[PDB]
Amino acid sequence: GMLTGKHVVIIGGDARQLEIIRKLSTFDAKISLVGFDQLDDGFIGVTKMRIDEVDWNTVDAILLPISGTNEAGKVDTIFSNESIVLTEEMIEKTPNHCVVYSGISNTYLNQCMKKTNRTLVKLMERDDIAIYNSIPTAEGTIMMAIQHTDFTIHGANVAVLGLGRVGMSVARKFAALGAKVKVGARESDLLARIAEMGMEPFHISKAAQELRDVDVCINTIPALVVTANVLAEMPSHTFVIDLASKPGGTDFRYAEKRGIKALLVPGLPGIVAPKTAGRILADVLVKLLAE
Amino acid sequence: GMLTGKHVVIIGGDARQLEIIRKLSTFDAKISLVGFDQLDFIGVTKMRIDEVDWNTVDAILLPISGTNEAGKVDTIFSNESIVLTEEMIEKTPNHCVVYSGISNTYLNQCMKKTNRTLVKLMERDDIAIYNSIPTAEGTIMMAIQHTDFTIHGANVAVLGLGRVGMSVARKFAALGAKVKVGARESDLLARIAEMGMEPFHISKAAQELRDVDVCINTIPALVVTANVLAEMPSHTFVIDLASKPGGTDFRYAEKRGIKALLVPGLPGIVAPKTAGRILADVLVKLLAEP
């Protein structure tokens, strides 16, 4: 009865959340479930409701999707067509010890927490979770690159921008699939690592020169790197997949203008491996809530 | 190795034909295009089937699928109906070669009766191996798309280590799946081991596929039998890449509730430009031979 006597509100999400809802249930947690009216299924301890029906002063924890909220406090859900906004007013009704869990945050969300004096846990800041999550993200990126190109990834020129937690997983998989992979980064240790991985490193400051023959470009850097000048030198058929958190790292307006297909693609793990991704979150959540 | 003086008629096709047209134009072949009135290409003459100067055609290039049993030639670049008849073929010079991917009864019989040579490009080992690449990509794309779990760490079986199977297995292994490959011949079982994968004798499929998440068939024989499917996990996804009717008992699969798909044409679906380039490269060589 790990989570016995604990009350959590689960607000929105995707298929990943189904794994979280299930595990928390089995551990005897009380669960108020918002944004899942389309969810035909039932679970022990789970009560579906509207955000305006939540009993805030008894909630030990608020579980938001990996994406958190938007700048207006709006929470995404694929299990309802209903709008869900998480306000400051709601959060202040919670007990002092109430903790909010997300994947990532933003200014709006960070500001709510700030002013309401509530703790916020951004699960994606845990390098381990971030690394595990890079696996389905890469899978989704590969699936997309294959789907949206009229040529094979095998033998194509592929650039990955950034050799962080995701970039490292993404680049490795394009290479293992037969792409000629080049990775852009600023840090010398990272450029060294790229070389060690048998890939072609380049200093990120030379993107414009280095991307002129690239067929597929995957951005992981959370900053404007795929600028107009970069885009201007790219082949007309290039596919840019931007994995960086909104607004990403691409001049989408310019890409569009010069006819380069560029997409900002979040939530890939929820789309391609929701069971795997969700169970990972569920496992960590059970542990964290049980502290 | 130019094709100057060569007259080729390209009848119908799809996006892969665009790359064939482009190579041939570069190699200076004279090209009559039938069923592309919606197109726009430099160095080509668009026309109707009924307008072709057969008397001077050195080669007829058909879609990968050839024709229907009535001689109909499909195209996505025109609303015009096209049927290649014996009468047309008969008026080509004696040396005229017809190129397709595969053939059928109609085509085989036109060729027999007119005494013209037919080349079925899909039968070539080189073409088969090149095409295995976009096939493997399509397969990976599909496996990723249809599963709620990562392929990384999943149990994946590939049946057959032939032309297609080797490429398919290699790519799932690169993706971090735990890959087992079924084959009959001891040399292929050896190769599977050398590739870092788990081999198993094809005759033990029923037994070895009891814990498989994704099963990819490449064997053009009934190997994913009722007995095999009856032992597999309920959630298993079967992708059958073997030529029709494939190598799976789809009717038992369906009743058993096992997801099983017969998936032809991956190269044309996921990479028609590469598929077209592969065809173009062989075609320029074959077309330049005396």
At residue A277, what are phi and psi to the nearest 5 degrees?
-65, -40
- B104 and B225 both lie in a single domain: no
- A221 and A122 both lie in a single domain: no
Q: Are A276 and B133 an interchain contact pair (Cβ–Cβ within 8 Å)?
A: no
Question: How far, rounded to the nearest angstrom, does the alpha carbon of residue A208 sit from its chain's CA centroid?
Answer: 27
- A261 and A133 both lie in a single domain: yes
Gap between the Cα atoms of B175 and B168, Å rounded: 11
Burial environment of residue A251 by CB neighbours within 10 A (0 to 12, 13 to 18, 19 or more): buried
Asked if residues B65 and B102 have their Cβ atoms less than 8 Å apart, the reply is: yes
Return the DSSP state at B55. Answer: G
For residue B207, which amino acid is it?
Q
Six-digit token string for A238: 């290039």
User: What was the elucidation method?
Assistant: X-ray
At residue B181, what are phi and psi to the nearest 5 degrees?
-130, 130
CATH number at residue A73: 3.40.50.720
Gap between the Cα atoms of B6 and B27, Å rounded: 10
Q: Where are the alpha helices (DSSP H) in A13-106?
A: 15-26, 88-92
Asked if residues B271 and B134 have their Cβ atoms less than 8 Å apart, the reply is: yes
Q: Listing from the earlier edge strand, what are the strands of the sheet with A157-161?
A: A200-203, A180-185, A157-161, A216-219, A239-242, A261-264
Is A15 touching B (CB cutoff 8 A)?
yes
Substitution target in B19, B139, B152, B273 with the highest count of A β-carbons within 10 Å is: B152
**CA-wise closest residue to A266 among A240, A245, A235:** A245
- B165 and B115 both lie in a single domain: no
By Cβ distance, the residue of A136, A139, A151 closest to B271 is: A151
The answer to whether the bond into A274 is cis (omega within 30° of 0) is no
For A222, other C-beta atoms within 10 Å of its C-beta total 16
- B283 and B258 both lie in a single domain: no
Substitution target in B131, B150, B168, B214 with the highest count of A β-carbons within 10 Å is: B150
For A34, other C-beta atoms within 10 Å of its C-beta total 25
Gap between the Cα atoms of B21 and A121, Å rounded: 58
Q: Listing from the earlier edge strand, what are the strands of the sheet with B198-201?
A: B198-201, B178-183, B155-159, B214-217, B237-240, B259-262
At residue B270, what are phi and psi to the nearest 5 degrees?
-95, -15
By Cβ distance, the residue of A139, A176, A275 closest to B144 is: A139
Return the DSSP state at A35. Answer: S
3-state SS class at A224: coil
Distance from CA of A90 to the nearest CA of B (A): 34
What is the helix (H) or strand (E) element at residue B56, kind and residue range? Answer: none
At residue B154, what are phi and psi to the nearest 5 degrees?
-80, 155
Gap between the Cα atoms of A172 and B256, Å rounded: 38
What is the helix (H) or strand (E) element at residue A60, kind and residue range? Answer: none
Distance from CA of B203 to the nearest CA of A (A): 30
- B62 and B115 both lie in a single domain: yes
**CA-wise closest residue to A84 among A30, A16, A9:** A9
Q: Listing from the earlier edge strand, what are the strands of the sheet with B97-100?
A: B45-47, B30-34, B7-11, B59-61, B97-100, B117-120
Is A136 touching B (CB cutoff 8 A)?
yes
- A56 and A132 both lie in a single domain: no
Gap between the Cα atoms of B9 and B98, Å rounded: 10
Gap between the Cα atoms of A52 and A157, Å rounded: 51
Give the per-residue SS3 of B259-283: EEEECCCHHHHHCHHHHHHHHHHHH
**CA-wise closest residue to A122 among A264, A245, A218:** A245
Is B195 touching A (CB cutoff 8 A)?
no
B44-70 CB burial, b ≥16 within 10 A, e <16: bebbebeebebeebbbbbbbbbbbeee
User: What resolution in Å is listed for this PDB structure?
Assistant: 2.1
At residue A34, what are phi and psi to the nearest 5 degrees?
-110, 130
Gap between the Cα atoms of B261 and B214, Å rounded: 12
**Residue written as tokens 């050896």?**
B190
Q: Where are the alpha helices (DSSP H) in chain A?
A: 15-26, 88-92, 107-116, 127-148, 165-176, 188-196, 207-210, 228-233, 252-257, 268-272, 274-289
What number of C-beta contacts closer than 8 Å exist between A and B?
Answer: 74
- A146 and A228 both lie in a single domain: yes
For A96, other C-beta atoms within 10 Å of its C-beta total 7
By Cβ distance, the residue of A135, A154, A275 closest to B148 is: A275
Asked if residues A54 and A32 have their Cβ atoms less than 8 Å apart, the reply is: yes
Pairing verdict, β A180-185 and B214-217: unpaired
C-alpha pair distances (Å), A143 with each of A120, A220, B51, B151, B225: 33, 17, 44, 11, 30
At residue A267, what are phi and psi to the nearest 5 degrees?
75, 15
3-state SS class at B97: strand
B150-161 CB burial, b ≥16 within 10 A, e <16: bbbebbbbbbbb
Gap between the Cα atoms of B241 and B235, Å rounded: 19
- B94 and B188 both lie in a single domain: no
Six-digit token string for B153: 């760490």
Asked if residues B235 and A275 have their Cβ atoms less than 8 Å apart, the reply is: no
Six-digit token string for B155: 């149990």
- A chain contacts of residue B130, beta-carbon cutoff 8 Å: none
Question: How far, rounded to the nearest angstrom, does the alpha carbon of residue A270 sit from its chain's CA centroid?
Answer: 9
Question: Please, what sign has the CA dihedral across residues B269, B272, B275, B279?
Answer: positive
- A chain contacts of residue B149, beta-carbon cutoff 8 Å: 273, 275-276
**Residue written as tokens 């970069």?**
A230
- B236 and B220 both lie in a single domain: yes
Pairing verdict, β A239-242 and A216-219: parallel
Gap between the Cα atoms of A94 and B120, Å rounded: 72
- Please provide the distance, in angstroms rounded to a whole number, between the alpha carbons at the two ends of chain A: 13
DSSP string, B162-213: STTHHHHHHHHHHTT-EEEEEESSHHHHHHHHHTTSEEEEGGGHHHHTTT-S
For residue B217, which amino acid is it?
N
Pairing verdict, β B45-47 and B198-201: unpaired
- A17 and A78 both lie in a single domain: yes
A181 Cβ neighbours under 8 A, 6+ residues apart: A158, A159, A160, A171, A174, A175, A199, A200
Structural gaps in chain B: residues followed by a C–N separation over 2.5 Å: 40
**CA-wise closest residue to B10 among B33, B42, B40:** B33
- A chain contacts of residue B133, beta-carbon cutoff 8 Å: 152, 154-155, 178
Substitution target in A14, A22, A139 with the highest count of B β-carbons within 10 Å is: A139
Gap between the Cα atoms of B110 and B15, Å rounded: 26
Question: Please, what sign has the CA dihedral across residues A97, A102, A107, A108?
Answer: negative
**Residue written as tokens 């064997």?**
B219
Asked if residues A286 and A278 have their Cβ atoms less than 8 Å apart, the reply is: no
Helix, strand, coil in percent for chain B, rounding step 5: 40, 20, 40
- Please provide the distance, in angstroms rounded to a whole number, between the alpha carbons at the two ends of chain B: 12
Six-digit token string for B113: 């009766």
State how many domains chain B has. 2
At residue B284, what are phi and psi to the nearest 5 degrees?
-65, -35
Return the DSSP state at B51. Answer: G
Substitution target in B266, B270, B279, B281 with the highest count of A β-carbons within 10 Å is: B270
Q: Are B271 and A142 an interchain contact pair (Cβ–Cβ within 8 Å)?
A: no
The answer to whether the bond into A247 is cis (omega within 30° of 0) is yes
Asked if residues A283 and A291 have their Cβ atoms less than 8 Å apart, the reply is: no
Q: Which domain holds residue A116?
A: 1-126+274-291
By Cβ distance, the residue of A140, A153, A275 closest to B137 is: A153
Gap between the Cα atoms of A210 and A213, Å rounded: 7
CA atoms within a 13 Å half-sphere pointing along the CA-CB vector of A182: 21
Is A58 touching B (CB cutoff 8 A)?
no
Six-digit token string for B18: 């665009």
For residue A28, which amino acid is it?
D
- B131 and B163 both lie in a single domain: yes
Asked if residues A199 and A251 have their Cβ atoms less than 8 Å apart, the reply is: no
Question: Please, what is the Cα angle at B270 between A133 and A169, to 5 degrees?
Answer: 20
Gap between the Cα atoms of B283 and B24, Å rounded: 9
A150 Cβ neighbours under 8 A, 6+ residues apart: B15, B271, B272, B273, B274
- A chain contacts of residue B272, beta-carbon cutoff 8 Å: 150
